[PDB]
Design a protein around this nucleic acid. Structure first.
Ligand SMILES: [Mg+2]
Ligand SMILES: [Mg+2]
Ligand SMILES: [Mg+2]
Ligand SMILES: [Mg+2]
Ligand SMILES: [Mg+2]
Ligand SMILES: [Mg+2]
Ligand SMILES: [Mg+2]
Ligand SMILES: [Mg+2]
Ligand SMILES: [Mg+2]
Ligand SMILES: [Mg+2]
Ligand SMILES: [Mg+2]
Ligand SMILES: [Mg+2]
Ligand SMILES: [Mg+2]
Ligand SMILES: [Mg+2]
Ligand SMILES: [Mg+2]
Ligand SMILES: [Mg+2]
Ligand SMILES: [Mg+2]
Ligand SMILES: [Mg+2]
Ligand SMILES: [Mg+2]
Ligand SMILES: [Mg+2]
Ligand SMILES: [Mg+2]
Ligand SMILES: [Mg+2]
Ligand SMILES: [Mg+2]
Ligand SMILES: [Mg+2]
Ligand SMILES: [Mg+2]
Ligand SMILES: [Mg+2]
Ligand SMILES: [Mg+2]
Ligand SMILES: [Mg+2]
Ligand SMILES: [Mg+2]
Ligand SMILES: [Mg+2]
Ligand SMILES: [Mg+2]
Ligand SMILES: [Mg+2]
Ligand SMILES: [Mg+2]
Ligand SMILES: [Mg+2]
Ligand SMILES: [Mg+2]
Ligand SMILES: [Mg+2]
Ligand SMILES: [Mg+2]
Ligand SMILES: [Mg+2]
Ligand SMILES: [Mg+2]
Ligand SMILES: [Mg+2]
Ligand SMILES: [Mg+2]
Ligand SMILES: [Mg+2]
Ligand SMILES: [Mg+2]
Ligand SMILES: [Mg+2]
Ligand SMILES: [Mg+2]
Ligand SMILES: [Mg+2]
Ligand SMILES: [Mg+2]
Ligand SMILES: [Mg+2]
Ligand SMILES: [Mg+2]
Ligand SMILES: [Mg+2]
Ligand SMILES: [Mg+2]
Ligand SMILES: [Mg+2]
Ligand SMILES: [Mg+2]
Ligand SMILES: [Mg+2]
Ligand SMILES: [Mg+2]
Ligand SMILES: [Mg+2]
Ligand SMILES: [Mg+2]
Ligand SMILES: [Mg+2]
Ligand SMILES: [Mg+2]
Ligand SMILES: [Mg+2]
Lengths: 65, 54, 84
RNA sequence: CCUGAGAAACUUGGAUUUCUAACCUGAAAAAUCACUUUCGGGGACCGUGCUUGGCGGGUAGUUUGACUGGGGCGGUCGCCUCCCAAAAUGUAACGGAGGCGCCCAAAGGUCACCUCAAGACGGUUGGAAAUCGUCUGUAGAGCGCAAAGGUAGAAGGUGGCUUGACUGCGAGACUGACACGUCGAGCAGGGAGGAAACUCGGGCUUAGUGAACCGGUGGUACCGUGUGGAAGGGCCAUCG
RNA sequence: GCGACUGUUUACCAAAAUCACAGCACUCUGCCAACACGAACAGUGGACGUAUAGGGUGUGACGCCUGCCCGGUGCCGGAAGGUCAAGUGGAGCGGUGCAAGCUGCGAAAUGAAGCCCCGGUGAACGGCGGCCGUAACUAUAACGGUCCUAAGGUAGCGAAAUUCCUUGUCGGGUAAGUUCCGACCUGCACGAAAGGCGUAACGAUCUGGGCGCUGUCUCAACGAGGGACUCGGUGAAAUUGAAUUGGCUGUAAAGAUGCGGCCUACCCGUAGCAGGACGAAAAGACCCCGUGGAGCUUUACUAUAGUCUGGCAUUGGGAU
RNA sequence: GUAGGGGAGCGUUCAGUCCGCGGAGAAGCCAUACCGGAAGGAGUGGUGGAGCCGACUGAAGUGCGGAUGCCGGCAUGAGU
RNA sequence: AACCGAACCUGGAGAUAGCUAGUUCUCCCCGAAAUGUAUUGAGGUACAGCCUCGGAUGUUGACCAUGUCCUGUAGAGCACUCACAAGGCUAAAACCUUAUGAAACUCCGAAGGGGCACGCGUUUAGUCCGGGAGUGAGGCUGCGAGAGCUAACUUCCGUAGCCGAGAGGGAAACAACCCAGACCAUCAGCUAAGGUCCCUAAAUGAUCGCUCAGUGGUUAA
RNA sequence: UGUUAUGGCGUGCCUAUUGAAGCAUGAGCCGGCGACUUAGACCUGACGUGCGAGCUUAAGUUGAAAAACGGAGGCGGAGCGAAAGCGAGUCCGAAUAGGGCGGCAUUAGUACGUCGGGCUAGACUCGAAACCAGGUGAGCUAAGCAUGACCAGGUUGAAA
RNA sequence: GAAACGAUGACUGAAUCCGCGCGGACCACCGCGCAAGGCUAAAUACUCCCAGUGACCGAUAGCGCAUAGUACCGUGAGGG
RNA sequence: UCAGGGAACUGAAACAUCUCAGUACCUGAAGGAGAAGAAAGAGAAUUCGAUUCCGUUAGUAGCGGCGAGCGAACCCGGAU
């Protein structure tokens, strides 16, 4: 039947043009007062994964969204 | 951090501006015992001076 | 009878590797930003063209080629010089 | 119309006390029953219906880590340093030593200035060692703690002013299977010390840490369901 | 030695020291009795019984007896206070429309049992214990005994069904006794109804010694009967890679008839032996592994029958 | 050359279609010294008694020595 | 109601089974892995590493010389650090002559090793993108070390080769050792390790010797 | 070609493994049955094909010894953000400097089919110990209840 | 969970037209609606049975059965 | 087919919410079918207009130890 979209992922991973998958950087809830400044700033953001651990994500969603 | 630690308590620095802002650091409390007066930036303008908020 | 021991150990401890040593050697190129050496201290002294982060890492301020010198045994720097 | 109050009256309740026509219960020519009556007593309590918390191995479902010269016992489980590691990085062992889960409002930024451990002689308390003096004096010291590397043209010791222990970023690289992690010129807003060139987005460095999730809090006005509002939610911050 | 006794028990490896018992003891229970089966206000056992009765629990005839600790747990009782749920009460907060207003949230005080707390309770749970130093090499046969939790063993027993050291020391029996009996006491680690110590009698119990008798034995013999063997009749089995299946030394996954070398050995069978074929039988029941299972246990987690408890409905009048 | 990925094919049935055989004898079975690189496939002889080969294409319950495999038959042990 | 710590029958039901077995036609080409990192994970799964197919690319691979920087082992040394042999000398500590040991000593310090460049001279691979995997138990000798007892068919790393996945000759026999990588055919030739009295192919060879012990054909103070 | 003597040579097969003739697993023999599949209009790929900045139907309808109709929806068309929104741009920010994107120095999709993989369902076949529901059993055994039955002969010698 | 609405077990049990109910807390606005009374063919599901077909089986296949729930086992359910 | 009752193994690589699944089973009633049905409705266009069925929206909106996994409807096309 229709392969389910992993709602596990509908707020944490992203497709694109090239097909590459992006996600965010980690450590922004109690990894705080640490800090450092470029850490706290670095972590709010977003980023493309490596490769190897790409396809999995893809298969988490068919629509790409 | 480590809860039942009384020295080096983690407390924040609220601006005298009222911008809606706060920094966050750690005084030994075997030191200040009153408050803290620091001079950091503030995105919502430029250069405030901060009171060590409760 | 047989054996009951009972001894334990108190060591068996170490720390995961710190990849030190000179990363970019002598006579090879570079790009700007490129790290040329990691070290614990001033095993290698900031020379003309090179900068020193908090780690005492040696990084390149602009491109070109890499120049090593030891000053007769115990004092030593790396510098940069372009392709001209 | 009343500040305080007295009779009456509606009383709406709280308690005990009592009464019985609910309801429970027994006996009498009709056994379980149902009449009818003496009714005998019980009596708004019990019992039962819904919710409230407690108790509850009586019953019911489960959990009970791993390494490991078998398993158990004991020991170990993350991070740092040093050998082992065969002159590149890397590398096991229940191999050989030791350390961290903080500390610092100055021990940080800048500016300026000072030089160390000891031994010899000689010196009031002292007299092995205290304080002062001179000759020696590249490290035989010091760095908040672990050691290694590092350091005297200072990172060591002392003062002036100070909040770069700063938002918006990130050229380029180190590193890791991934996730992480590490260094960083330079640009902007805006500062700090210097007279300046400058230097600074924490400390000589490498330990001083915990991903998600759910929630607290300070902003923010992106979402808010016929519509405009508010709950709630998102984003930055952050706390457990 | 153990139990008192007659009895009972693991159908198919345990018959006893198990269990039951008469006896005693603690508690519980006043009748629609507790307690128990139960869709359940049914109906039933308890019981057509009534505290000289009924339940539950423990010890286990009888005889002399049954001590010391109430701090923890349990249980019985106590009440000043700490308290605690829903409900009662809502000051105050805010959302909204111009609004009468609808509404989101929600604090004081009050408020059930129960726990905290105070005391009592052992024929309730239980408790009735740590230690001191010795000449030498980092040590062995041995020491006499002062004693922290609530107390730290009264009688009786004690090398025992209990004893680590262990064949303890002594005595008896024996020619000789790790066993047994008596005493001893340094009880690793007896002890009073989880009974203590005794005891006639009882026992297909257990333990040692004796007399008697004996092929149990020295040491086996002869005999008998039923098999085994032979012939005619009927004729299974488990096993089985396939075999044309020796021995010694060696090698090989380390226990070789199969490889090496060397020895020995003509083909077949019959009655017999049990060394080998790691012989057959059951994918080991021990051991490790499995984020396998089931039984059981508790102050591991979560519920929950049941049960206590406040409010609500059945549910009413009145007197103060 | 083991796990593994790739390449080309052999055989079995059912099916569409064509070549076509068969009581002067089909399939199946039995023997053999032929052919193909192999899965395989031909010649002839004996069996049998009424159906079948070949090419191309399609679809599969499509190829067994193992599973202490399942059903059945017959061996060993034994003239014990 | 012939095996009760939870009857038997039917059913959910083909529960699950990180476990054990088993998994059939043929030829050809390539051809591994038992390492890392996590894991209520350790005989299991993820990602890399390694195989294979195919599309891109163009010699980027590979060995080897050169050039060039990085290093702190082997040895060595005593200059700090702990150790320690004799002697001086003083009031012993220092310090002098003489003297030595070191994984966690280093005035010194190779052989090698690695990065970059060049290709000055050879050879073939490399790298990317996309499909399919399997493997994640390793084993032995040689050289390096640790734990051991300078024990082990011992164990835990490193490193080369081999078996694993390797037939063929040799080592009597013998995964690992020495030679060597089997596309078929041949009643054809040369060699390797290893051999040449007979078993058993091939000199009972040649010359200079040794041992007389059956050493050879298993050990030491 | 069948058989044979003599020679040389030669460690059954499978599975499991660091390593099998193994004294390690399996199996007496021969037959026959016996295991990598199916589904979905899911996912992603390789080959192929038909149309090609375009490609395509599903349910159904009608006819049916055949197939045609059926645009409802699907895939492509534009990205970027948390989202509003902006759009060959967008986002963070106050702009810079950047991630994603378009151009790019260039390139095509879609529907069918065959196949290599994927997911959800038994998913290669066989194998549990167990777990739950509904029922069947006291003609065995454990006992209860009502009712009948049964114990040669002998010894001992209590109360009264 | 911001928990709307329906739905009922126990307590409470409002308005009837200038009224009632909903629009996912809640408020106004603005929209969709007539609770407390009933029946209803049609398309849809199944297939003991009847018929037609088949790239379904032909005697270990196919239902368990070329027939039989019989022989046989089981006290029984049930297996077969 | 409707209703009263309502499991577990399993999966989440352990389990308890959760998933298995209102599935297996038990029961009640009834028919040739049944159920449902004539709006206090969907809803967002001031649009549709009893139900049941299929296609589709759509693995989209959402649910969830936000883990495993669970998963609509309005519109649009048909059946009637
Ligand atoms: Mg339990
Ligand atoms: Mg373990
Ligand atoms: Mg090296
Ligand atoms: Mg390793
Ligand atoms: Mg979670
Ligand atoms: Mg907030
Ligand atoms: Mg808000
Ligand atoms: Mg007795
Ligand atoms: Mg018995
Ligand atoms: Mg017996
Ligand atoms: Mg009370
Ligand atoms: Mg004696
Ligand atoms: Mg007794
Ligand atoms: Mg008796
Ligand atoms: Mg005797
Ligand atoms: Mg005979
Ligand atoms: Mg042989
Ligand atoms: Mg032999
Ligand atoms: Mg015999
Ligand atoms: Mg076994
Ligand atoms: Mg045909
Ligand atoms: Mg035929
Ligand atoms: Mg067979
Ligand atoms: Mg066998
Ligand atoms: Mg005979
Ligand atoms: Mg015989
Ligand atoms: Mg015989
Ligand atoms: Mg039985
Ligand atoms: Mg099931
Ligand atoms: Mg099964
Ligand atoms: Mg090859
Ligand atoms: Mg391993
Ligand atoms: Mg992989
Ligand atoms: Mg090259
Ligand atoms: Mg040395
Ligand atoms: Mg010199
Ligand atoms: Mg593993
Ligand atoms: Mg290894
Ligand atoms: Mg081993
Ligand atoms: Mg292998
Ligand atoms: Mg070989
Ligand atoms: Mg060989
Ligand atoms: Mg040989
Ligand atoms: Mg060997
Ligand atoms: Mg030669
Ligand atoms: Mg010869
Ligand atoms: Mg096989
Ligand atoms: Mg083995
Ligand atoms: Mg054999
Ligand atoms: Mg065998
Ligand atoms: Mg085995
Ligand atoms: Mg195509
Ligand atoms: Mg396709
Ligand atoms: Mg599959
Ligand atoms: Mg409601
Ligand atoms: Mg036949
Ligand atoms: Mg049949
Ligand atoms: Mg379960
Ligand atoms: Mg599970
Ligand atoms: Mg009926």
């Amino acid at each position: 039947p229709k392969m389910k979209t992993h709602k596990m992922a509908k707020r944490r991973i992203k497709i694109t043009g090239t097909g590459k998958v992006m996600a965010f950087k980690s450590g922004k809830r109690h990894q705080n007062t640490g800090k450092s400044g470029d850490e706290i700033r670095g972590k709010g953001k977003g980023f493309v994964l490596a490769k190897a651990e790409w396809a999995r994500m893809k298969l988490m969603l068919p629509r790409g969204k | 951090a480590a809860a039942g630690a009384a020295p080096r308590i983690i407390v924040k620095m609220e601006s005298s501006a009222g911008t809606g802002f706060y920094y966050t650091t750690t005084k030994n409390r075997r030191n200040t015992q009153a408050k803290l007066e620091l001079k950091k930036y503030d995105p919502v303008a430029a250069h405030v001076v901060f009171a060590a908020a409760a | 009878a047989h054996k009951k021991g009972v001894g334990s150990s108190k060591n068996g401890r170490d720390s995961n590797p710190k990849y030190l040593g000179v990363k970019k050697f002598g006579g090879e190129v570079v790009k700007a930003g490129n790290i040329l050496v990691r070290q614990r201290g001033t095993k290698f002294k900031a020379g003309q063209g090179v900068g020193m982060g908090r780690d005492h890492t040696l990084f390149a301020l602009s491109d070109g080629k890499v120049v090593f010198i030891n000053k007769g045994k115990g004092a030593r720097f790396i510098s940069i010089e372009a392709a001209q």
